[PDB]
Amino acid sequence: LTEEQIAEFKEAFSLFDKDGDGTITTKELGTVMRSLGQNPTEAELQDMINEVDADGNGTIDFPEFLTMMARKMEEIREAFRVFDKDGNGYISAAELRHVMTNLGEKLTDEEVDEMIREADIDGDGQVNYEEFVQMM
């Protein structure tokens, strides 16, 4: 398997990891599902462990995580299609409401231009294609 997406999955594992000892408990999963808007309880966290709990340690190990992503799930290529609704790389001031709708964070009303204006190259009033290769 291509180790680019596996290194991306290691980055995603460390994104999920908070105690940093190689094992992921249930509480990291509960906090990451509560931080992205959703409201889980202990029952959903518990049996969602028990499905993945083939290793039988109550935690998420790394290679079973890797094949669990390799089951269904590029990463930023599928993410760039969220940016590119229009297909020309432009993410306009009008198109920015169509990108940030399905995230979870309440977008601001003045700082949203400062996110563009610091990142924009010449000031075309949009977010172009060139703000993806050398911005991420």
Binding site: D21, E42, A43, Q46, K72, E78, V82, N102
Partner: protein
Amino acid sequence: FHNEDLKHILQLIEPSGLLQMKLPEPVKLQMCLLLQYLCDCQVRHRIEAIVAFSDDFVAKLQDNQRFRYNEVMQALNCPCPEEIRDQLLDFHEDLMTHCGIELDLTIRGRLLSLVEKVTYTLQQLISETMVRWAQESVIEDPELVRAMFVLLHRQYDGIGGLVRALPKTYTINGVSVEDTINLLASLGQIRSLLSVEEEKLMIRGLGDIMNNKVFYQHPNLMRALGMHETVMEVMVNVLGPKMVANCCRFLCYFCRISRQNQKAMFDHLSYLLENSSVGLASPAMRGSTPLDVAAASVMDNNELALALREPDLEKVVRYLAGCGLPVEGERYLDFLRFAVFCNGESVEENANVVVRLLIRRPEGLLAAMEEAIKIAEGNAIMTFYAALIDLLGRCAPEMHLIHAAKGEAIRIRSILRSLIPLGDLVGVISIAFQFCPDHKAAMVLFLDRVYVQDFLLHLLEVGFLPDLRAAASLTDMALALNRYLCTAVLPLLFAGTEHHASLIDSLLHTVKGCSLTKAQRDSIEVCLLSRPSMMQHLLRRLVFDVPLLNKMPLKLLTNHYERCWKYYCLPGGASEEELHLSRKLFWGIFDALYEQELFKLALPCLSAVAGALPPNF
């Protein structure tokens, strides 16, 4: 009576004979039980074909709907807005959502065809011959009359018998046909032993169930056979030695295997707590009490913990009213710890109820438990008064602001702080450096929950006095070392030289390993929250640590305490000579060719601390 014989036998009774004649009473009673057998195998045939259609149908269903859903989530993904949540459900709820709306896809014709067959002979004649008997022949013998109308009602409601058939059937493979049989051979031995050594055949019977590969794989099956109630009514029959325990150990394993099993075992808690016949300890009977079944019934699930109510906890403290002499009282408070906490954070409802019933009868404690600390020629009191404290630490209102921004969680916290003094430092610091490890951690988890940094220095000379200096003394001392790595974490939240004396003793103790790194995790943030003259003095031992660094115990102490010394070098914003060797001996490791990529970034803060602050023995 295989295929040739039943044609001889049915067409002896059918032709359409035996049934047409006139018969006396206690023979047609015998025929009625015979006639029930034919309908029973008719029911058996209906289930054997309803599992036959099922395997072919889900082979059409799963190979369609799992496969065609895979086409949608590659053509639409957007992790889970709407169309995921229709297929994001429980697997039980997914089954009802898939098929069970068809009484308002492409296979909607096929299952609708089957119910037409399972609409539905001899149903005509049994409904006829029960009428023909009961009309002309005015009946005594109510054992017969009860037997007649059952076969009438079972005939007219053949659906309702099948309604109580499907929550007993179960489907498995050809792999399981080995271990299932001698399971059933053992289970039938227990059902046969229900009516009566009598003990040893049950113990031989129960353990052979407990070593089966098909005993964990299908706990729905073991629930559907009702074999929790089987062993329980055996134990119900025994109660008013080892025959009680060896079935009781099976129940504790029975609830541990799944949550949905444990809900079914909840409904027997009323009888089960009425057994103070076992609480005189004598281990290893402490894995087999009827209390211990009551333990594992509530043990984890917070849903189960909220459902139980006040007469359950009334009887337990009624037994604690009996303890006015003892040793049995430690196990009741062991049970109530599983009634209030259950996850790591307490419940808010049962925690209120138990302490209100713990004031209506009360039973200095540290004035009394100190006097028995040298009692010899005993410990069952020393764990008891440790247990009652360990209970009361669990029913704390909140470490969250529910304690802060609310009344009615303080009213009860006022009770907890009033019944005890501070007091416990009898057991916390003083006696606990000699029994040792079980009770000092128990007194911590009370004091942390109920009751800033002035008592940080006041409650020093604690823990690492005997323990962190005796790393080669290893055996109860060795059993205490990994225990207080995690207990000493929550003390994250002048005498700092003595703290550095224990920390260097902790550094020698850090010279299990996941928890030893956990006590390092409470140590690495400890110097960050340090007047910094001790933090500058602790960095002098860090150069003493740097001499013994440039193994893995110092390698985690190299890159961490270097940036932490820069966090101690915020005070500059004397011993830089040893710091010059500290960059030199690190450069002496740099020319030698692990986690050394961490310590290499710690070298630039060693010049930035000199750019901010300085501008085996």
